[PDB]
Amino acid sequence: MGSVVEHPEFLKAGKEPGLQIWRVEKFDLVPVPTCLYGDFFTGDAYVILKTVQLRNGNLQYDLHYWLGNECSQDESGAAAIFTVQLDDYLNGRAVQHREVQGFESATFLGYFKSGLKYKKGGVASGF
Amino acid sequence: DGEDVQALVIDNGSGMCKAGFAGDDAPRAVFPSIVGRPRHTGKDSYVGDEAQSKRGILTLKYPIEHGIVTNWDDMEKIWHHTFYNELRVAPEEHPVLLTEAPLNPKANREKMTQIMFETFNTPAMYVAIQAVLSLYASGRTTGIVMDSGDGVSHTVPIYEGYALPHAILRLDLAGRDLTDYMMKILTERGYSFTTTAEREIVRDIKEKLAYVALDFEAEMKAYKESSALEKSYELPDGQVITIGNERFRCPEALFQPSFLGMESAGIHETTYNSIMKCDVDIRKDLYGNVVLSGGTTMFPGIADRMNKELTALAPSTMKIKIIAPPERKYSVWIGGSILASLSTFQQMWISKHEYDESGPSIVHRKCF
Numbered sequence A: 001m002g003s004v005v006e007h008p009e010f011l012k013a014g015k016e017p018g019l020q021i022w023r024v025e026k027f028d029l030v031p032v033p034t035c036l037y038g039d040f041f042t043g044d045a046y047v048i049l050k051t052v053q054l055r056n057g058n059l060q061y062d063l064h065y066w067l068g069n070e071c072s073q074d075e076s077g078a079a080a081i082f083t084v085q086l087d088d089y090l091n092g093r094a095v096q097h098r099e100v101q102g103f104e105s106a107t108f109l110g111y112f113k114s115g116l117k118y119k120k121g122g123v124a125s126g127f
Numbered sequence B: 001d002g003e004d005v006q007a008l009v010i011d012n013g014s015g016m017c018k019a020g021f022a023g024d025d026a027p028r029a030v031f032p033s034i035v036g037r038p039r040h041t042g043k044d045s046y047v048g049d050e051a052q053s054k055r056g057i058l059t060l061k062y063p064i065e066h067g068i069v070t071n072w073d074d075m076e077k078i079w080h081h082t083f084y085n086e087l088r089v090a091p092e093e094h095p096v097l098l099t100e101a102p103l104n105p106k107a108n109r110e111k112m113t114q115i116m117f118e119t120f121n122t123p124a125m126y127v128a129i130q131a132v133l134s135l136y137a138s139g140r141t142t143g144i145v146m147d148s149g150d151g152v153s154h155t156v157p158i159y160e161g162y163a164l165p166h167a168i169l170r171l172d173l174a175g176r177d178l179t180d181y182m183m184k185i186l187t188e189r190g191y192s193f194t195t196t197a198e199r200e201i202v203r204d205i206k207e208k209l210a211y212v213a214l215d216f217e218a219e220m221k222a223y224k225e226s227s228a229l230e231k232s233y234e235l236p237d238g239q240v241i242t243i244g245n246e247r248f249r250c251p252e253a254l255f256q257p258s259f260l261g262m263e264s265a266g267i268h269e270t271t272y273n274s275i276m277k278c279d280v281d282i283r284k285d286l287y288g289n290v291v292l293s294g295g296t297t298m299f300p301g302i303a304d305r306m307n308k309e310l311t312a313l314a315p316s317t318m319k320i321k322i323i324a325p326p327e328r329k330y331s332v333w334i335g336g337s338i339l340a341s342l343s344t345f346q347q348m349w350i351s352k353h354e355y356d357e358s359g360p361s362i363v364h365r366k367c368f
């Protein structure tokens, strides 16, 4: 009796307006170095939380799970589940979005002021 | 097999049990969900293939019917076999994830939980809906899963990670009904397939040579006129039979249940009906994420046909997408393997401590 994530990254998620990016790495949610934001390994999957300040004092959340063309099934399956978990952790308030390489929404692409970039490669599968 | 604590995953079906280790990409043990007991004497019991092979002296049963457990004593034997004969582990040393059918009865959920902690002494366990685990395995949190196995089919709309229970639909039309129907139409063709051994041969024809036509009537037509698409099949004795339009007439029963004397809607219309019971604002994301799962979705052509049928049911501008992963026989199991391997799953399990405090009814709050 309860079922609450204690992961250190959940404790940082959505604390203030901004952009947070995590990569799936062998069944874990690992922060991306902020200097690397916008560069996506096509062989991987990622979780993106965009936090916006509301006039009301509370925060708006959009959760995007990005799937590279060569990411393995454990990675795209983890990215999705982590997305559900992060939304729950945030009291259901996030709006979830599935982003596929080559087909991302304009809002998502609009988060990367200097233009999202794809690069081949990535971290090996957790299976 | 075993990271720190090694979780296990068991996907119990009406026809097959799929079991293994969290973190692997496939179930290590796949066996028939059958329990055999003596017609007369020796208490004793057999599971799976071994039950089938001594069938002439045993009374064979299926503890799961249409995805639901109907015999707990035989369900315990499947599990005992799973842990000790198939996976070779000590259940008391591993967290166990288990899967259930959509809408599983409340008392069944308790019982499963009770057996794990009291009969097997698992240190921790979890229950997950089969259809939700396939969706996850396809890398999505919103979509509709059409899951069809040996004994039951379901259409399950999911949104932001959870099934929408009011829109789930059940159809007691599946793999076994299909094998039976192929037995009957091959028998009308002029052959004879009526026994148990014959049912097994027929299941194999169904899995090797059957397919779904894109256009039923044009196909019937092409076969009425040409022989080009007929196939041979060698029986276990070396006799060879020829399969004609039975190839596609058997799985046609998924789309036309009247073929089996059933009055229900086919899988395409059941899918449509589930979508239409959901809020209009998510429907677009349902049509755009139709995931097929389970052994009975393995027929060649089924995705195209589902694509066509849904296209014909929905507004012409609706974008339809049928996703049919090559591994969809094991999607449920794989989703479970992914879920239980996550660094964040730790707190999601029901622990022994939580069981000792609330009892079996802990399952209704933890396994949502």
Ligand SMILES: Nc1ncnc2c1ncn2[C@@H]1O[C@H](COP(=O)(O)OP(=O)(O)OP(=O)(O)O)[C@@H](O)[C@H]1O
Residues within 6 Å of the ligand: B012, B013, B014, B015, B016, B017, B066, B067, B148, B149, B150, B151, B152, B153, B174, B175, B176, B203, B206, B207, B208, B293, B294, B295, B296, B297, B298, B299, B329
């Ligand atoms: N290649 C195939 N083509 C068509 N049918 C197949 C194929 N392979 C397996 N099936 C059928 O799939 C069924 C078993 O699939 P599955 O493991 O998904 O069902 P289950 O989980 O045991 O049953 P249920 O989900 O109804 O409880 C059997 O009817 C089997 O004949």
Ligand SMILES: [Ca+2]
Residues within 6 Å of the ligand: A043, A044, A045, A070, A071, A072, A075, A121, A122, A123, A124, A125
């Ligand atoms: Ca990768």
Ligand SMILES: [Ca+2]
Residues within 6 Å of the ligand: A087, A092, A093, A094, A095, A096, B160
């Ligand atoms: Ca939400």
Ligand SMILES: [Ca+2]
Residues within 6 Å of the ligand: B012, B013, B014, B130, B149, B294, B332
């Ligand atoms: Ca099943």
